[PDB]
Amino acid sequence: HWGYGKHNGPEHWHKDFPIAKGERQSPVDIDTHTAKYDPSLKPLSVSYDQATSLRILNNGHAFNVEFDDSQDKAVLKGGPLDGTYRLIQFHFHWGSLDGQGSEHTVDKKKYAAELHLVHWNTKYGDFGKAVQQPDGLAVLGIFLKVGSAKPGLQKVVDVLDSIKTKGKSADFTNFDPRGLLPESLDYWTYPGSLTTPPLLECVTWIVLKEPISVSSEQVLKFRKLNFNGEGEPEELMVDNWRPAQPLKNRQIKASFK
Ligand SMILES: Cc1cc(C(C)C)[n+](CCc2cnc[nH]2)c(C(C)C)c1
Ligand SMILES: [Zn+2]
Numbered sequence: 001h002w003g004y005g006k007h008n009g010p011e012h013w014h015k016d017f018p019i020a021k022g023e024r025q026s027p028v029d030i031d032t033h034t035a036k037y038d039p040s041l042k043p044l045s046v047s048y049d050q051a052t053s054l055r056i057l058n059n060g061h062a063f064n065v066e067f068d069d070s071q072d073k074a075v076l077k078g079g080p081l082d083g084t085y086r087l088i089q090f091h092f093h094w095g096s097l098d099g100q101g102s103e104h105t106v107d108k109k110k111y112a113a114e115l116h117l118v119h120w121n122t123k124y125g126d127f128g129k130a131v132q133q134p135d136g137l138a139v140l141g142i143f144l145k146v147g148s149a150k151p152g153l154q155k156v157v158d159v160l161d162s163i164k165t166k167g168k169s170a171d172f173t174n175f176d177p178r179g180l181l182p183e184s185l186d187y188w189t190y191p192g193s194l195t196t197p198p199l200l201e202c203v204t205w206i207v208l209k210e211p212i213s214v215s216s217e218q219v220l221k222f223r224k225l226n227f228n229g230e231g232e233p234e235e236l237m238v239d240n241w242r243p244a245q246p247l248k249n250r251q252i253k254a255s256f257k
Pocket of ligand 1 (some may be wrong): 088089118127128131194196197198199200
C-alpha cells in the first residue's frame with residue numbers, strides 16, 4: 001500500500017497508479033515569471049460563513065477536517081470556476097524540517113507546509129462522481145511558513161493529541177475555516193490532479209500567492225502525529241508531500257500582476 005516511505009513513496013506510485021506519469025499531474029513548480037496574468041479571471045468567492053465542520057480523522061497519510069457537504073454551506077465559486085464547489089474537507093502536507101513540506105513550490109522555493117481545502121462540483125452530485133470528471137474538484141492551496149502563530153489553527157493543533165494514530169477520529173464541530181485564510185485572495189491557477197493516489201486528473205488548482213504563518217510550536221505538533229496505527233511501530237507523520245511534477249502542456253495563469 002502506498003505512502004511516503006523509501007519503498008512506497010511517490011517514486012513508486014506509478015506502478016499501481018499509472019496516471020502518476022500523466023499529462024496533468026500535481027503538484028507543480030509555479031514559475032512566477034512564466035505564469036501569465038489573465039485579466040478575464042474573476043475574483044474568488046469563498047463563502048464559508050455557514051460551514052459545518054464535523055470530525056477530524058487521521059487517515060494514515062494526513063489528518064482531514066471533514067465538513068457537511070450535503071448542502072451548499074461552505075462553497076467556492078468564481079475565479080476560474082464555473083458553478084459551485086462544496087467544501088468536503090481540508091488537510092495539510094508538512095515536512096520534517098521547516099525548509100520543506102509544501103507540495104507546490106514557488107520559483108522552486110519549498111514552504112514548511114501546505115493546506116488543501118478540497119471542494120467538489122455540485123453538478124456531479126457527490127464527491128465520488130466528481131473525481132471522475134476533469135472539472136470535478138477545486139482545491140484552494142495555501143502555503144504555510146513558520147513565524148508567528150496562526151490563531152485560527154490552534155483549535156486544530158489542540159485536538160491532534162486525540163488522533164495521534166491511523167484510524168483515530170474525534171468530534172470537531174464548529175470550526176471556522178475562515179481563520180486559515182491569508183489577507184489576500186490573489187492566486188495562480190492551473191489544471192491538475194489529486195496529489196495522492198489515485199492521482200485522478202480532476203482538479204482545478206487555485207494556489208494563493210500569500211502564505212499564512214504558523215508558529216514553530218504549531219508545526220512541531222503536526223510532526224508528533226503518527227503514520228502508523230495504535231500498537232504498531234511508531235513512525236512520525238512527517239514529509240507527507242509529493243514533489244513537483246512536470247508541467248507538460250499546461251500554462252499557469254495568475255489573477256494578479
Ligand atoms: C484529498 C482526498 C484525496 C482522495 C484521493 C486520495 C484519491 N480521496 C479519495 C478520493 C476518491 C477516489 N475514488 C473515490 N473517491 C479523498 C476523500 C475525501 C474521499 C480526499
Ligand atoms: Zn493534499
